[PDB]
Design a protein. Structure first.
Lengths: 326, 326
């Protein structure tokens, strides 16, 4: 009854996001209760002693679906035969690191990983970029993997998306499943556009707070853009558990499908006039098996076009900063 | 299609174990995909600002099954209407505290929580004790909860159990599902007895290292007893993620059943001649719906009897130390 195993490479495997992510792959949640998995865990050389501890805890989960745990600091070894890749590792923005230097340092990392992905992974591999700057990191990866269809490399805006649903559910007082047709446009950043223009709350066709453009502009959109900062202020650490959760959902829907709109940062083919060659978050329907399609037919009003353009502006700017490494 | 909601109280809800546990409750893994959940999260007064961050991250999971998140620093408020309680919170060893103080101070915590549970929780509540000293904490909880059936309060040895399963699988090279009839006897401590006396491995009928009593004594048992120290040495932190995993598995099997032997620390009714009035880990079958039964009929050899007696001795000594909280 079990399918043949699939292989998942995860970088940054020693981090806090991996600490939540990996158990929810090994438990069968990400890919399904009948899908055995092999983990290829990649870390920096100096973190290899700690990565052995990660393997120990995963073994100590006694997971029936986990057929193998491979540890390495070699990206070529990591991506061998990979069916799926979740790229958590990158260079974080530290105090007094210039924005362009962080973008370029990460460009070199995702250039190397794109090259390794192209050489070593399976032909149909799906790659998810979590590490920031995600959209640009995804673009750099694809530019350096000419044999991977660009659409099989996406960046995660799913946490923004889910944070938006959570704001709506709290404001309206509904269940999560009552919300339909929500989307994040643009960059995984503070310029993102959380878009309520087409959103519906089940049964609610009349007076509803999500129609209130004053609430949208002054509360909803800024609350979603700054949600990461609020959690840091409350907990003193960044939102590792919800980021891993968003990664799980992104991959699960990508592989198994989801009838609802979800957000993914995807290669722009000019949908809605979005400039080509950038990765940009859009409303998509995931049909499963790695196939998705941008939601078609949406009229974009001028308030939306303004907001989307602000995020497209930042993505173009990011691309120019790393443009000599493509 | 959805069941009526159940309420789960979790103490120590800001800790590292909770950070992994709560998302694997909210996702429907612990209790089933069609069982809505309400979380009542308990912390110390000084951690309430951080606990708001926990709620924020869980909301950002956009979990359809998570109907409510209630936060409090009051044990009376926390356990109101509880159907389930997972007790992670306790007092770690700190300045001025000897081993006896660790037992007595935690007994005082669990005397208070058993009192609150008895008063506030629903009549069929199932209580899982994770905080150390687990067996003794559970015993104190039950002694101070006269209207809760003692079998509805257990202490967690599932992580010891799963660690043994991983040692077998690594040494023998089999799948986790190939292993049957394994159990942990005694205290959740270094005196535990990981018992291979009845274990089977699918397909392996001849020479096999789990028959070798010297390997059991010199490697397997100490590796299982000292596994927590090994993870701390490798990672620099304790094994929060796998302890949360064991708690999910313990509660899941308690409620939904499991055809394999699992280990739980349960009130002794004299099974295998074990003294009454202590909580002691035994091989059990979880039939689901809160009901479990000790595996009956097992012939206990002299090596096993010696080891079990050593852990019973420790449990009795622990009970005498905290006897004034009965």
């Amino acid at each position: 009854q079990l399918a043949p195993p699939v292989t998942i490479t995860v970088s940054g495997a020693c981090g806090q996001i991996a600490n939540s992510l990996l158990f929810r792959i090994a438990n069968g949640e990400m890919l399904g209760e009948n899908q055995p998995v092999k983990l290829r865990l990649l870390e920096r050389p100096e973190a290899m002693k700690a990565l052995e501890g990660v393997k120990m805890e995963l073994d100590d989960g006694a997971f029936p679906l986990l057929e193998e745990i491979y540890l390495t600091d070699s990206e070529n070894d990591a991506f061998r035969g990979a069916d799926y890749a979740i790229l958590l590792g990158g260079k974080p923005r530290g105090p007094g690191m210039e924005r362009a230097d962080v973008m370029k340092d990460n460009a070199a990392i995702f250039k190397a990983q794109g090259e390794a992905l192209n050489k070593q992974a399976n032909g149909d591999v799906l790659v998810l970029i979590v590490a920031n700057p995600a959209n640009t990191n995804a673009m750099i990866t694809s530019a350096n993997a000419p044999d991977i269809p660009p659409e099989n490399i996406t960046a995660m805006t799913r946490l923004d998306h889910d944070r938006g649903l959570a704001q709506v559910a709290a404001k309206v007082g509904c269940n999560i499943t009552d919300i339909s047709r929500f989307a994040i446009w643009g960059n995984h950043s503070a310029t993102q556009y959380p878009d309520l223009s087409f959103t519906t709350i089940k049964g609610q066709w009349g007076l509803n707070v999500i129609n209130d453009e004053q609430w949208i502009t002054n509360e909803f959109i800024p609350n979603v853009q700054q949600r990461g900062a609020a959690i840091i202020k409350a907990r003193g650490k960044s939102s590792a558990a919800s980021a891993a959760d968003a990664a799980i959902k992104h991959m699960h829907d990508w592989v198994l499908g989801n009838s609802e709109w979800v957000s993914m940062a995807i290669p722009s083919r000019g949908q809605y006039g979005i400039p080509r060659g950038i990765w940009c978050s859009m409303p998509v329907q995931c049909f499963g098996a790695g196939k998705y399609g941008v939601i078609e037919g949406l009229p974009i009003n001028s308030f939306s076009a303004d907001r989307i353009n602000a995020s497209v502006k930042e993505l173009i700017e990011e691309k120019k900063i790393v443009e000599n490494l493509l």
